[PDB]
Amino acid sequence: DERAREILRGFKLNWMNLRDAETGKILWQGTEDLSVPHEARVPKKILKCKAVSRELNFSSTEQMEKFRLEQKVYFKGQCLEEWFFEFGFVIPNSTNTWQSLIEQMMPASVLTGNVIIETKFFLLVSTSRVRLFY
Amino acid sequence: DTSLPTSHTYLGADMEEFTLHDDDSCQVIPVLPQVMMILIPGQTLPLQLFHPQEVSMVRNLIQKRTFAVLAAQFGTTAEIYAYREEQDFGIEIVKVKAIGRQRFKVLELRTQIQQAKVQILPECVLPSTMSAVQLESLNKCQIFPSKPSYKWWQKYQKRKFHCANLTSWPRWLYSLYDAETLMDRIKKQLREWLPSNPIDFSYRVAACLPIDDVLRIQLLKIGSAIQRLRCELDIMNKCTSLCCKQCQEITTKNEIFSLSLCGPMAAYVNPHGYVHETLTVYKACNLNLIGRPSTEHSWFPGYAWTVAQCKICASHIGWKFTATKKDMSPQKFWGLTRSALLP
Amino acid sequence: SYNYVVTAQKPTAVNGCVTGHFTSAEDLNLLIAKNTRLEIYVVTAEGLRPVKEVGMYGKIAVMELFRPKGESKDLLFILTAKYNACILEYKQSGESIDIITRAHGNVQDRIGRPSETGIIGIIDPECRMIGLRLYDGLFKVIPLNKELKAFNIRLEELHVIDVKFLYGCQAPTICFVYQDPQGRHVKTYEVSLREKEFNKGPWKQENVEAEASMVIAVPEPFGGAIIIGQESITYHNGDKYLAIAPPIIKQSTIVCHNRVDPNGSRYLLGDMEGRLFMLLLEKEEQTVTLKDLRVELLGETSIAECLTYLDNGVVFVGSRLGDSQLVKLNVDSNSYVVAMETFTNLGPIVDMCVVDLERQGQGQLVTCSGAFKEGSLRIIRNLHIRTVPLYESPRKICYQEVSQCFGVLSSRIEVQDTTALRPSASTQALSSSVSSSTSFGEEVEVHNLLIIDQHTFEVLHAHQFLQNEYALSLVSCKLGKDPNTYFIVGTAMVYPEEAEPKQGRIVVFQYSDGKLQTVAEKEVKGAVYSMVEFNGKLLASINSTVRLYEWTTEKELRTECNHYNNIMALYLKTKGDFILVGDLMRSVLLLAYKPMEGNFEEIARDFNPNWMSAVEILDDDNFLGAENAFNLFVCQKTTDEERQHLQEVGLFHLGEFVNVFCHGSLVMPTQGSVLFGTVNGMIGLVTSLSESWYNLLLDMQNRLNKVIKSVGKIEHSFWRSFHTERKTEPATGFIDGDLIESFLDISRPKMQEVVANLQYDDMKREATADDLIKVVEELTRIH
């Protein structure tokens, strides 16, 4: 899709910040473009928190009629959990924050490096996979 | 300022602002799942309910309003004093500002979001302790001019309880069991570190006290104002300092101060749902700080928050609040969670 | 559980007094409201004459005589603390005397808390109506209506102090002293019956003394109203405003008054310290107008809750704190008051003890009556009463068998300079000893342990206590292996600043060889509110710490165990291994000291919030108490929660505020005998009854209520139904001993009506008058 290619060229994750929702401590922060089709040094403290507040600030060069996202968690190729978000209208060449949630989980030792977060930014704009190193 | 945090401007200025129940009349009342804190009648509880079941529950309640909060032995019925609903992010967030109105004991726990069957505990108000042995002649002497310290209360004893020579007990005993003397004593010990009604004040200062969950449900179990006030005075005399629950001395009692009309502590809502019974205080030690000062969703307008965890076991137990402007009175303070503090 | 409450001594404290023409237009009588009793005394030159002592099912919260137009003699408005209002006429037919109830009703409001300034009730001088300030923010009004239909009128001033109906007005006019946050003001309302509402009074609000706390309406030709406070006394009548501030009155607050002269020129006042003044009104003729107010100290009398000038210079000083006395106002001073007669007044009974003084097997009771200068020891036998004035407030008494003497915990009010106001029993002791271990005019309470001989009652000793060492409780008892028995006192140092006492002392005295010398003293960190001899080991109540104490061989008290109840144990009674602990909130907690463990263990608990005054252990099962509003009750000790919970088995409205319970009987069917004392000077008695006897006597109560027409037509079940600010439930497990005992007095045909179709078990058979009279005689013999 031409629109998908234009969005991928124009879109860029400025900075992401994953933090405990019960406290707000910045468990992990980064500036890599997670939307591009990597590895994330997220600590194991995510396993020890009830939920995570997730703040993906993204700059988009093209407007999205309904900007939304799908998230999946895979443990050694086996789907562990799935998430879905929705921000909505986005103007071209605009930078916008994305405040949302990430809610039995396996021990960090088992999931250390064996966790894949598949993030699909949507029409489908891009897909990517991030290897989590607890 | 002193009146900034009470309205919860962080929950949004616009809100649908708007329920006495029969005494001892059992009611089937909704119970929300997100409330783990022990509420008191009169303590304000704000709320952020974004779960679909919770949102439907709030819509059903306000389509009528009163809901309930558990601790699950006893609990409190609170009426909703402010409503807001937002459809942002595709989630029908519902932001509420209720206040505890009445009390109850738990009889049953139904499930649908609970609809627990609960019996309302009546406000067991007692009359004046001297209303019994009051002499018909001396009844005219039991009203006093407006209070203009020690001499005034000596006159209060020597006049109000002059009929305590009829009974088999001293004046100061009835002063211990007097409502107004307990009012004065708790006020003195609070200003060392409010409504005129003994019941409302008793619930207010029950909210004020930084006490255990067990002690707070104990106070809820109390029916009469005088028993409660006596228990709170005993607790305040007993309480000395606050330590982290995981450590088992972040903060001392005397350092406590009140930045809100609700008291030194109040229930405040995390920006994404959770509730903390945060206690304001002017001094807190052994707290490592994480995060730059941010005004995003600050509970106290004109202040910037910053996470505070005890450096011993790194457990979050509060936040540091720094004024955005130097003119703010005070310049900075701390807010500590009751859930993580062990008196 | 089944109990039987009877009145061994009728109440003697004079709640109220009013003089008027009740027997006849030519007979001046002094009606005396001795709480639940109403004595119609016809006044004579020789003195008072008993004419009729009616038993009211109710405390007379208000009394007043009034003659409506066309009424030969005054009618009597009686309102009860239970808000039973009744207007009564006194009908005499030969030797048969009866008080007809002209019109009765209940004036209780469904809502509204009672006014803190008491149950005020005032009759219009023209007798068009009755006004009543029962509840703050309302004014009940009864026009003159056989049912006493009362309608409320809203008054905006929720702190009315004293309200009286003015005289010489075109329409009725209340004048009331109320309190706003500004201070005291004096507003008048012209109460229109046709409109049934308040109208603007003859004169508007006039600011008065901040402690202006009594209103007295004046008769014509003066009109207006005198108003009395701490220091100043005012008089208001339209524009006329006469004020004085005598130095005499600043000493004591005036609390009672009584008109002397019908024209209103001469008034009588009394205060808390027993002083009695004569408020003279100067008479000026212009029409008539007041000239000036004068107050003359007539003299010291009993501490009066009411005054009534009868005739010929004779005054009745009706006192709840002391002997109500007929004093004569001499024209020439001696003091102008001279006591003609001294009526016995046992109230307030602060503590007592049943002791066999004569050792004849019948217990002679010894009560601590009176307060301040009217304090006394009253010795009661079968009902002969002997008064022993102490001239200071006695609080607690205990008896020693070996020393043949009582230990009385007396307390006298001294003024810092300290100086005693009067020569008290402590200062008149043969051998006094001061214990060893503010501004001028402030009234401190100096506390002594008097030792009084049982025979002569001369104070054999007086052990004054330390500065501010309030003596709370006292027990005489042997302890441990010590053969000597000790006067053991619990004390608390009560400083003005500290509300809760942080310090105290359990002091062990021994009155041996005519001298009370301290044997030991334990400085406990708290207040020792109560104290008992638990099985040879001393049990004390140090705030919320019920602590046992072994009397060591070194003659020193060693703490054994503690039990922290979260309530300070003000009431501490014991029977065997069973320990009744209680607080003033009706926090009845039953412990059981286990000797095998040597530790206290709670076995039952009932923290029902209600004001409490005294308790007792009727037996191992039952525990008598005394609830908020003049109440008696008995609690009783399948499931741990059910087992560890005292069921409020039996209930009763005594009508008297019980102060004290004591095991014993006044005499040489009903098991047990627990006398009790009252602020109103009653010695009542509780005896546990059998189930069959209780059923028979409750059926008796129902039938007699059907037959006996009490004055005011007050239903008995309402009278004895429980009463609180929030609750009102019928009595259970108690039987009105007065009602059952009234069977012997009612007529024989009425007796036949009562005992008709009643099953009586001696096999159950139809009852008869003689058998059941014998039953009630057996009941009367218990006291």
Ligand SMILES: COc1cscc1-c1cn([C@H]2CCC(=O)NC2=O)nn1
């Ligand atoms: C869900 O967590 C977050 C994500 S971004 C900010 C937070 C947050 C905010 N707060 C408190 C801190 C004290 C204050 O003044 N305001 C708050 O609301 N706690 N966590």
Ligand SMILES: [Zn+2]
């Ligand atoms: Zn810690």
